[PDB]
Write a protein that binds this DNA or RNA. Sequence first.
RNA 1: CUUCUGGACCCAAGCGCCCGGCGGGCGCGACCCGCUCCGAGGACAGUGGCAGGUGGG
RNA 2: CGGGUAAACGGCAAGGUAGCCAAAUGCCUCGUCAUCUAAUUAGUGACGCGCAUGAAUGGA
RNA 3: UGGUAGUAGCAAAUAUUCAAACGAGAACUUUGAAGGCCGAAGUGGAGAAGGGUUCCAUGUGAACAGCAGUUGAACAUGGGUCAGUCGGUCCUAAGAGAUGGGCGAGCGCCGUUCGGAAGGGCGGCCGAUCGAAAGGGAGUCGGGUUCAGAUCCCCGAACCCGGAGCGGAGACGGGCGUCCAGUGCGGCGACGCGACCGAUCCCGGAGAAGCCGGCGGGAGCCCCGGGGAGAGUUCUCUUUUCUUUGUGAAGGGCAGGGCCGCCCUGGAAUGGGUUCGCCCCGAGAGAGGGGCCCGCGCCUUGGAAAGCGUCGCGGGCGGCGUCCGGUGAGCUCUCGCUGGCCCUUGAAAAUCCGGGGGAGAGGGUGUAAAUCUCGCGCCGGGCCGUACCCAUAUCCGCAGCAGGUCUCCAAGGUGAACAGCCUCUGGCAUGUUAGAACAAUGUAGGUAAGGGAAGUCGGCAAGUCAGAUCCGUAACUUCGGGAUAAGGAUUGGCUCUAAGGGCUGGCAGCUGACUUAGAACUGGUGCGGACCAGGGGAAUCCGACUGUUUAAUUAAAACAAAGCAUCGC
RNA 4: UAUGCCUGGGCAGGGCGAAGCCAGAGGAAACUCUGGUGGAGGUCCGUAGCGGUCCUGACGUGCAAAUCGGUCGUCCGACC
Lengths: 50, 66, 104, 154, 68, 91
Amino acid sequence: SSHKTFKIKRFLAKKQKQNRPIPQWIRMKTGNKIRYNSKRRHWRRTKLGL
Amino acid sequence: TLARRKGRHMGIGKRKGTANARMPEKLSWMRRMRILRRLLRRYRESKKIDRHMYHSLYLKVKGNVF
Amino acid sequence: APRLTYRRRLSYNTTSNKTRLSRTPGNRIVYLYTKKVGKAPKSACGICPGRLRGIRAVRPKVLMRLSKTKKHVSRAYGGSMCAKCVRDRIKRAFLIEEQKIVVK
Amino acid sequence: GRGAPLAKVAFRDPYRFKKRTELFVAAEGIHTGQFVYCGKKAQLNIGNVLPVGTMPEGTIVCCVEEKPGDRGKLARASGNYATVISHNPETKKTRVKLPSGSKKVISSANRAIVGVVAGGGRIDKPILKAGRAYHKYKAKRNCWPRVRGVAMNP
Amino acid sequence: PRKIEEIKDFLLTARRKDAKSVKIKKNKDNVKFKVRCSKYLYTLVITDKEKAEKLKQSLPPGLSVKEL
Amino acid sequence: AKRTKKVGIVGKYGTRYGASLRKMVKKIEISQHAKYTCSFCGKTKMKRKAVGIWHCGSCMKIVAGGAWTYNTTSAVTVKSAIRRLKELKDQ
RNA sequence: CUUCUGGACCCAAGCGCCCGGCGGGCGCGACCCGCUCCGAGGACAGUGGCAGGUGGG
RNA sequence: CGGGUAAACGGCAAGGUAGCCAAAUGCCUCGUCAUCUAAUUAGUGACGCGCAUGAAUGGA
RNA sequence: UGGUAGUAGCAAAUAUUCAAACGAGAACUUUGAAGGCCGAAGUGGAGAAGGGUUCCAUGUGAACAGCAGUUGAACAUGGGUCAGUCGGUCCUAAGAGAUGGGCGAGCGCCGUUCGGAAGGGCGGCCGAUCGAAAGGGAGUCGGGUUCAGAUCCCCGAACCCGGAGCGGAGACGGGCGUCCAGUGCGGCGACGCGACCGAUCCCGGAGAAGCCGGCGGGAGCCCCGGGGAGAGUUCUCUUUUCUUUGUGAAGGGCAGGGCCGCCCUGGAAUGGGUUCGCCCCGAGAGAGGGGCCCGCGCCUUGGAAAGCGUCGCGGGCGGCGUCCGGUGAGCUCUCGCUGGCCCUUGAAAAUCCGGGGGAGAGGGUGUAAAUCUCGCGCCGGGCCGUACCCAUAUCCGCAGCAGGUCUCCAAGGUGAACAGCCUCUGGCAUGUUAGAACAAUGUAGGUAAGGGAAGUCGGCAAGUCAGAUCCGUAACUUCGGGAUAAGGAUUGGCUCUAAGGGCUGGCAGCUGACUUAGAACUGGUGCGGACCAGGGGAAUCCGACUGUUUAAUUAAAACAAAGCAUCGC
RNA sequence: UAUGCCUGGGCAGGGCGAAGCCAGAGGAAACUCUGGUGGAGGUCCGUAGCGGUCCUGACGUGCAAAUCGGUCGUCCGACC
Ligand SMILES: [Mg+2]
Ligand SMILES: [Mg+2]
Ligand SMILES: [Mg+2]
Ligand SMILES: [Mg+2]
Ligand SMILES: [Mg+2]
Ligand SMILES: [Mg+2]
Ligand SMILES: [Mg+2]
Ligand SMILES: [Mg+2]
Ligand SMILES: [Mg+2]
Ligand SMILES: [Mg+2]
Ligand SMILES: [Mg+2]
Ligand SMILES: [Mg+2]
Ligand SMILES: [Mg+2]
Ligand SMILES: [Mg+2]
Ligand SMILES: [Mg+2]
Ligand SMILES: [Mg+2]
Ligand SMILES: [Mg+2]
Ligand SMILES: [Mg+2]
Ligand SMILES: [Mg+2]
Ligand SMILES: [Mg+2]
Ligand SMILES: [Mg+2]
Ligand SMILES: [Mg+2]
Ligand SMILES: [Mg+2]
Ligand SMILES: [Mg+2]
Ligand SMILES: [Mg+2]
Ligand SMILES: [Mg+2]
Ligand SMILES: [Mg+2]
Ligand SMILES: [Mg+2]
Ligand SMILES: [Mg+2]
Ligand SMILES: [Mg+2]
Ligand SMILES: [Mg+2]
Ligand SMILES: [Mg+2]
Ligand SMILES: [Mg+2]
Ligand SMILES: [Zn+2]
Ligand SMILES: [Zn+2]
């Protein structure tokens, strides 16, 4: 909704910044095992609820 | 709307609402009251009729006389 | 017929969500939100059903920025009591105060 | 909620410059602008609040105090009243007849409003619709549609 | 906006300390002198064009004048 | 002028609630909506505002009377009884 | 010490006494004394603990 | 133990009164009669010792 | 991981086609054209709850979008939500919940006044606090600007609250230098004038009060006659058809509306005034003359400089136009008047104001106290929310799910109609695919000769009837009804006739716009021509009725119901 | 979702037409009759809305773990 509280909007800010893909220079490190960001969330498939 | 203004397209076979729906009876009575009461108020102010014949005709106008 | 919309997020026809149609200098019919119809003060007697005369019929907080002459009349009980019950109370106060002298 | 009207009687505070407004059970016959009087030396008129001991026998009163000073408990419904049967100056106890037919011996200091509670004859009108009975209890409480126990389950 | 009816009252408004500027609008039937004060836009409507130059030259010096 | 034969004011209920019940409310629906003469002003403007409340549209007098009539028979009998008890109490 | 009315009603008038350099204070007015605020109950209602009856709630 | 109480449960201690019915209630039963149709286990109106109707377990 | 099996299926809501462009690649994208749909209770334009970056730009075509895709609500990279006056914030609504007190083994619970409860300026309060983005609640609108924001930015014109410079008011002078006044003033009155002292205390008002009927005013929209400016048509006709033809808040003035709720004069029966209805009057009509409130209307400051239309020229310069009218049971909105209904009477509080009272304050002859934005000037207005979707693809239902989810604005024609049908503004591409064919069997729609329920548990399904007008309407009844009972006739088009108004001048002139009735003519007897749209009657059973009920197999004779009666206190 | 409470929102067009009122008639009188007006109601047809009768229709590994179509109930009230 347009009528947001500060805590909810701040909560949506953190979840929006975490939705980035993994930078490709991480995959070139020594003991790298991460192929891709497995915690990606889509707005239509997984709802936050909070 | 010019042909209907001359009476065309308004026969019996063109009516679908009740006569009271097309022209309300309460409206036709209200139009007649304001017409007849304005006539008596103009005749009383023009001294054509006195306040005693006016008040008598006012109650006869309120009845279905004229 | 240009259909117009609300200008605020309140989309319900509540008592505070009242509007009127206004023509802008740009030849546009827009919604202009109206203010509630204020009522003139009522008589303090509690008998006369009519409102007081000579006082603006505006909202309560609007009376804060109105001049005192626009909220009362030059009579004794003006702005609070109607002129009719003032004349009655002037007579009732005198006639009762005279009877309390006759009983003595 | 109640079928009897209530009167907004105004009094003067005997100790402060204050207008005391009370809410009585309107006796039948009173009107706005009437001067009603409360006390033991007030006259016997409809609407006045008198002790049940300072009144003649057979006096029709309403809003009778069950205990001395309870501000009126008995005969406060529309169209009801209590009759002062007899007195007893030795024990200072009056015997009153309640609207249910029972005769109760109360103290002679219990104040009461002389007259009958207004709104009488309300039950004499047959409620014709179920909707009229709905609105009757819609202001009282949630008890009107009474399912029979024989219509329920064990 | 407050409309001024007299020429004398217009000079008292243009001579104020909060008078920022005075605009001169030459219309078809009149000429308007709109002085911008702190709160209200005072306007004097002069009908005849003869009193336009009479009032234009009588404005206090230092007040910003603009022709529209 | 005579639109109905016997129902009159209770013709609004149609064929509902029974003949006896529509006849009992007829005596009450008439007395409830009837305008009475104001004993304080004289104008016939006493109308029932609520149950047991009767208001005059001219002198603005509010009188607490009966539920369906301006005054019940049990009230005028008590008023005359209290007056008779008051005079016998003073002497 | 208030019953004729849809009024008004307080923040002492007055007297006595006293202090300041025109003001202020006290008393009477507004009696004194006193142990429960005023009434209705009352060692009964009631409370806790045992005992009997009743109890498809 | 005794009294009252059935618009209390109920029954008809009392022996089903007024009513009603082969009924949404009749086992025998597709009862009998009339009517309704060329033909009716249906329908209706009647008849009622009614297997097992019936009066605020409300009758009509 | 198989057979099933390249099978079921990719079938609800009419529909696409042509050309071109980009591109390796086009039934699906984009532009243009044509043909259609939604048809203003929209497939339109904006919100609330919810979602949370889905919004916007560019790029990718790998996975996803059940065909494809050059496309996307996908993916990747950047960007985007600007407020004193919009809401939150403030108030208490039902409520919820501390303190005292009580209880409880105990976490705690009960409880919302009930205890030395006033932390203010002589004090009454009686109950801290929480609880509404639909209640209460001061005050911003117009134009312009973005790829996405807008009553928030920009420009212009204001307003409100809080806080400490001018002018004006108070201030009117008399009597003999002196003495003495002066906390305004007008009107018979309603009441007026730009202010016009005053506290504790007191009183009152506004906030702040249902639903329904009818009427009138104002506006927006629609409609009609013109005049401009563009455009369509121009085979024939058409001075034609279509589009567009305006002025915010705030201030002032004036129409208009309301005072059966006010004022003065006066006095009423031959009673009068008056409405659609009512209603009103010796507690004072009618009449005349006033006063007040509302004036969202018009004019005007704003203000045309801007906006718009059109013609040009080079973020702009210009020309020209933005006009004159007339109607209404029209449609919405809003303001009034007035009545009806209730065994229904249809909120509180914050906040703001008026009055009563006159404790006090102010200066001694020109001022002082004081001044309700009186009129101006100066300063400040913090915090949070603000993008977008708001639903046959942005919410919920496992999904782009034929379900579900609260509203606001509402064009023309037909018609009684916000019915159905057609069109304009706006929107869309037929609802998760296409091509070909037109077998059976289906689902949906329709017709059928002759007979007319012989079908079947059963007229199930289907059909008949249907609108309006003029007629005619029984048994029975609680007298209300039954009833649109039943049974009949008429219905088009065109051409006339008659009847129903208003304004102006004292009958005359001018001007309507909505209908009814009658008649003639006319036709392949067709005419509520589509659409919309009751089959009826005679009885029995049950329930009085309206209402309610097993969400997802039972809408009933069940429950409820008024009435009746009993029982307790 | 069941129910009470609080605060809001919403509910075309028509039919029959109740009390009150006006007038004209009839009558020796009591009183009656007619026309109009008025717009009552858990009124009627009916849109939105809310319901969900019948087809025991469609679907029935469905659009849907209850939906769709026609038909149908009610639609100022115990309404939504
Ligand atoms: Mg979802
Ligand atoms: Mg009528
Ligand atoms: Mg059961
Ligand atoms: Mg057991
Ligand atoms: Mg027998
Ligand atoms: Mg047969
Ligand atoms: Mg039989
Ligand atoms: Mg019996
Ligand atoms: Mg996008
Ligand atoms: Mg993109
Ligand atoms: Mg695909
Ligand atoms: Mg993404
Ligand atoms: Mg709060
Ligand atoms: Mg609000
Ligand atoms: Mg936007
Ligand atoms: Mg004073
Ligand atoms: Mg200020
Ligand atoms: Mg937005
Ligand atoms: Mg879809
Ligand atoms: Mg299709
Ligand atoms: Mg055939
Ligand atoms: Mg057969
Ligand atoms: Mg059928
Ligand atoms: Mg029949
Ligand atoms: Mg029988
Ligand atoms: Mg029933
Ligand atoms: Mg079911
Ligand atoms: Mg019927
Ligand atoms: Mg419907
Ligand atoms: Mg269905
Ligand atoms: Mg089926
Ligand atoms: Mg199948
Ligand atoms: Mg029906
Ligand atoms: Zn008054
Ligand atoms: Zn009176």
